[PDB]
Design an enzyme around this catalytic site. Structure first.
Site, mmCIF file in Angstrom:
data_model
loop_
_atom_site.group_PDB
_atom_site.id
_atom_site.type_symbol
_atom_site.label_atom_id
_atom_site.label_comp_id
_atom_site.label_asym_id
_atom_site.label_seq_id
_atom_site.Cartn_x
_atom_site.Cartn_y
_atom_site.Cartn_z
ATOM 1 N N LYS A 197 -5.221 -64.878 57.616
ATOM 2 C CA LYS A 197 -3.859 -65.802 57.890
ATOM 3 C C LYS A 197 -3.649 -66.598 56.430
ATOM 4 O O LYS A 197 -4.840 -67.247 56.086
ATOM 5 C CB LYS A 197 -3.714 -66.730 58.989
ATOM 6 C CG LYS A 197 -2.562 -67.763 58.969
ATOM 7 C CD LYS A 197 -2.884 -68.795 60.014
ATOM 8 C CE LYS A 197 -1.682 -69.643 60.093
ATOM 9 N NZ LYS A 197 -2.039 -70.309 61.292
ATOM 10 N N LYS A 209 -8.425 -68.078 57.243
ATOM 11 C CA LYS A 209 -7.246 -68.846 56.952
ATOM 12 C C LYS A 209 -7.292 -69.725 55.989
ATOM 13 O O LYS A 209 -8.439 -70.826 55.632
ATOM 14 C CB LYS A 209 -7.049 -69.706 58.310
ATOM 15 C CG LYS A 209 -5.686 -70.390 58.530
ATOM 16 C CD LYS A 209 -5.643 -71.124 59.725
ATOM 17 C CE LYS A 209 -4.732 -72.164 59.674
ATOM 18 N NZ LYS A 209 -4.279 -72.529 60.836
#
Ligand SMILES: [Zn+2]
Ligand SMILES: [Zn+2]
Ligand SMILES: [Zn+2]
Lengths: 341, 147, 341, 341
Positions: free
Chosen positions: D263, D210
């Site tokens: 992500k 992320k």
């Protein structure tokens, strides 16, 4: 007041302990992937046009320009100390000799073929390697035959180099080392050797990864090789070009090279590592170039480092990076130091 | 007393120095002692001091013994007394040891590695490039390569 | 009542700690495998048939259709800010120009060769790249020469593209970039360059992995390139086709490509990763396509993201995926931002 | 005059021919390493503090903030169309709720546990995933518990997150997805699940890689998540940090992750490729973030691209990069489009 602080510690993990393997002089030898021997050395010779020469190359410390009548005396002691191989460089000084096509490159009466013949006769045990290129024989000083614009002419160049290489072999050279960096020359030279029925007895030692650079200064003086018509950056690999050097090693091996040379050496040790994996099945050779050589002599005369010491460090560096052969101007020195070490 | 290095006491001390520098405001610590297991102790020390999340640990993972540190000894008045440093510094021909030292140090917490010397050890930088492919590699152009 | 629960914890494992490596701005730079520089940018130019043009391409934000007499004024400031290379796209608007065989592709009086000649003269330091294709010159709008059924004619197409590519090089272009996606064209273009004695000086930048898609919308408007006779899905790679793209990179490299382009870019970053291993020894280039470009401008005008920010994120994304070059319409912007960053 | 030149050509090499594999619509499907199905979709839900809410999140197109009494009506049609899983995001708006330790994160009367309980009852076939983090429940807005200086407090944070995660599972959630990016949290959460005898029935879906960035804009509005006390660059990965992301995937897998999330998604497709090799044995999930989502809607409203089209291209892109799961706000759309396609 300020006292020595010592942090609390957990027991020693065995994985942290490398020390048991190099706490003794012998262990430091056991630790090398390869040890340096006298047969791994290749000494370069600059043969002159004048058979009585024994001329001093001011920029190349303790190296001369030797004529054929001065060869037996020079080589006798080296060979008595273990020298096993030499690489010939021709320096034709007679005027009129140079031309646009490097005609004199394979001149039977030129220095190279004359030196080959002399050596095979007075030193039949010596392994003869001949550099293959046109720079020392072209009037423009470049490595191959040029087009009119000044750029290199690939097909005509490789066509010429192939002939020179076969001619040296025909004269008695056991090995040919092309240092021209021109695309596809190895294939043409190998094919030329096969057509001459000399490929089964001629080692092809290619300068597969030869970089452009600031380290050939003294060699230009010794071989009267400096170009006319710019830089050599179009065929010599750029210093940052690791992909090109990697593709050039695969190419050359594919085209027939029996061994590869990395040049320069110290400044390109990572390249030797790459060649070690790509050309894992062939002998790798490091070339300790004229400029790396004189840089060691200057730093040493400056007190920066110790000749013998830095020479051993640098030379074992080649063997560490993966080389098993070394072309170096310190050969006379090493042929002595190795007796002791 | 024999003159040899005392691993546990050494790493114990180095760990303290490193945390103290960080405590003082240094963003990064670079141990160049070459003593077995010091990175782990220094990382653990940083964690215990709540400084590991803000202190980069740049280890001299592959530091070789050699003839190239001459001028640095003069600048830092660092020359030893009691011989050579060949027992902890890697021998020049020791490529396996250097390879195991890079894996060790990374495993022990190094956030980045230093190869030293540099020009004379470029193949070693190539090896570290594969072994420590995920961390920043740093070359140290040593005093002797420099002069 | 509900109180904050905190689970019992074991000491921290060193292996969990990554934080020491990116807690400072500089560290975030140390963390990139490659940093963005001005020389990595390649700016596309749409050269017009009308030397006085400086026409607005409504669908392509801040990009125009420039004629030759308007080139020195456009390029002077860019070059003064560091621009090092450009990629030429020709847009011949004169009627009668287009035909079934893309005849005008290599027209010496066409925009491309005219722009090449102008550039080599007023900007001799600029590196000139020319896209190689027939879409902008064919009356049907497709990328190659068609059979009667409407399908592409491989041999005739590659035969034509090879000629166009050599002709551009003959005119002075330093690099050729075929974006036709037709089987075997790289080999024919390389062979054509070799036969013309231009292969040693012409970089062949292939669009090795060029996907079909919804992101070329604005470029069709700028080059008046839209096809006639369907989709381009037979030669452009399907979006899900990772195996084909992988085999196309190996093919093109084998056929002579000196570098590869991945296109589109952001939407195909995993493909750049693959090329990074397959074509590890060659320069990889990302093409930030017209539609990815205008998508960033719209989201930005919508307040969704910030232009400069998302431009840096997206562009460093290419370098992260493995690219070392970038063809992008944000070049004028970056040539400014890089001064600061 | 200028006539179309066609270079002489050699017969076609079979190795150049890729075309036989994608000249038909079906073949383009045969060409994907993985096809998109309804069960691969995961739809995010923002549960409100007010059970009667059905509030419009202005920056997040067609997505609302739903209270529990409005859930059965919202989810009934989705589930009737094939929805198999959802990811819960809590948005407690009652004042006094937030504090420095994210106390309300696991509040049994909070939105998340209330939504979990409602779902397990009215939709027992739905797979429930709960994001695990403190940002939406801390008064400072950061992802974990802070020290006094403003920096994150690792041990206290992971200690807290571990508790929240186990509490969600205790309430009935089948899966936990920590998106805090704090060092070592996966290990603590896994250990916490094991101590609670819930590890054999709780999937741990970590947001292993992320990145920090300009693409979370609309999500901050929907979850009233924006931090106070700077940026999140100390725990979120820098965009150029590919080595850190690679070490974070190995860490998380080693610490117990049963699956990984990348992500953002489109902007990080090369990262999905890396995870595909490193975490080759676990399910990879792409998160199509709020900003990538609204960027597609803006470009589409601008006419730049076509929603449905670019949505399919982008989503098959995830599957091409190696993902087998997708968390996306276009789920309602896809649950419809997949019937046809
Ligand atoms: Zn030469
Ligand atoms: Zn085209
Ligand atoms: Zn959070």
């Amino acid at each position: 007041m300020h006292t020595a602080e010592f942090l609390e510690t957990e027991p020693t993990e065995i994985s942290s302990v490398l020390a048991g393997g190099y706490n003794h002089p012998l262990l430091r030898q056991w630790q090398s992937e390869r040890q340096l021997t006298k047969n791994m050395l290749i000494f370069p010779l600059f043969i002159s046009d004048n058979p009585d020469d024994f001329t001093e190359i001011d920029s190349l410390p303790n190296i001369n320009r030797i004529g054929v009548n001065r060869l037996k005396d020079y080589l006798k002691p080296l060979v008595a100390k273990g020298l096993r191989s030499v690489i010939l460089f021709g320096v034709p000084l007679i005027p009129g000799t140079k031309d646009p096509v490097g005609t004199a490159a394979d001149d039977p009466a030129g220095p190279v073929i004359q030196g080959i013949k002399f050596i095979r006769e007075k030193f039949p045990e010596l392994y003869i390697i001949c550099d293959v290129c046109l720079c020392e024989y072209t009037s423009h000083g470049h490595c191959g035959v040029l087009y009119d614009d000044g750029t290199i002419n690939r097909e005509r160049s490789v066509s010429r180099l192939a002939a020179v290489a076969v001619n040296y072999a025909k004269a008695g050279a056991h090995c040919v080392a092309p240092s021209d960096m021109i695309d596809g020359r190895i294939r043409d030279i190998k094919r030329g050797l096969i057509n001459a029925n000399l490929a089964h007895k001629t080692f092809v030692l290619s300068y597969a990864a030869k970089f452009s650079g600031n380290l050939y200064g003294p060699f230009r003086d010794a071989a009267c090789s400096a170009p006319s018509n710019g830089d050599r950056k179009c065929y010599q690999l750029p210093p940052a070009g690791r992909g090109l050097a990697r593709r050039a090693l695969e190419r050359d091996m594919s085209e027939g090279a029996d061994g590869i040379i990395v040049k320069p050496s110290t400044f390109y040790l990572d390249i030797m590592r790459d060649a070690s994996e790509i050309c894992k099945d062939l002998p790798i050779c490091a070339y300790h170039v004229s400029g790396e050589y004189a840089m060691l002599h200057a730093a040493a005369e400056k007190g920066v480092v110790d000749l013998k010491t830095i020479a051993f460090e640098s030379h074992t560096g080649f063997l560490r990076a993966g080389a098993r052969l070394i072309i170096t101007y310190l050969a006379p020195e090493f042929l002595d130091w190795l007796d002791e070490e």
